[PDB]
Amino acid sequence: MDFEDIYRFFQDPPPHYLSKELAVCYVLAVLRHEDSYGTELIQHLETHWPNYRLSDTVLYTALKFLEDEQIISGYWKKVEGRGRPRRMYQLAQANDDRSRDLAQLWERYL
Amino acid sequence: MDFEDIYRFFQDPPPHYLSKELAVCYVLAVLRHEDSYGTELIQHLETHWPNYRLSDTVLYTALKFLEDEQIISGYWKKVEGRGRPRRMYQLAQANDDRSRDLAQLWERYLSS
DSSP states (O other): OOHHHHHHHHHSOOOEEOOHHHHHHHHHHHHTTSOEEHHHHHHHHHHHSTTEEOOHHHHHHHHHHHHHTTSEEEEEEOOTTOSSOEEEEEESOSOOHHHHHHHHHHHHHO | OOHHHHHHHHHSOOOEEOOHHHHHHHHHHHHTTSOEEHHHHHHHHHHHOTTEEOOHHHHHHHHHHHHHTTSEEEEEEOOTTOSSOEEEEEEOOOSSOHHHHHHHHHHHHHHO
């Protein structure tokens, strides 16, 4: 323990990993603006909201929930230069106040 | 999970245990107003700032640091109707008031 290490923590504290509940609301906040995919949802968090991180396990949990609830749907998309397609997600509906409200819990949490 | 979990999470998330760094600043914020003791420092944190908790492990890390750096000192106090004495803590007299700066870091963190 030492003073440099203290103001360190305060000037640039380490991030927290999202819980499944936060992850659901984050993912919805993103998809309300653009379709996305797992790798990007993780990376976008680190770049846009660097006090937070998202693991593959929690991301999967959130996506499975949102699919089970029919709030999002998945689709395959080509990736230039690659044979293997990419699994994209989009909001399942045009108008869904549930997705809007959940996204708003994220923006209010922040 | 279900949607009720979600709203319930946002209404009352699990509290965050203080890191050793935040615990040093919290303890100093307390001691700038009053002498205190371990069990009180832990309880006071939860009662006044319920989004946080302090463990005995992290508290004793913080207290040992602050004693080793000569910012705080301890003394023994007699508790009514009890054999076991109580270790109290207070800011030591010093020229360089290290506690102000660190206490500020707590309060600023709270508003952030």
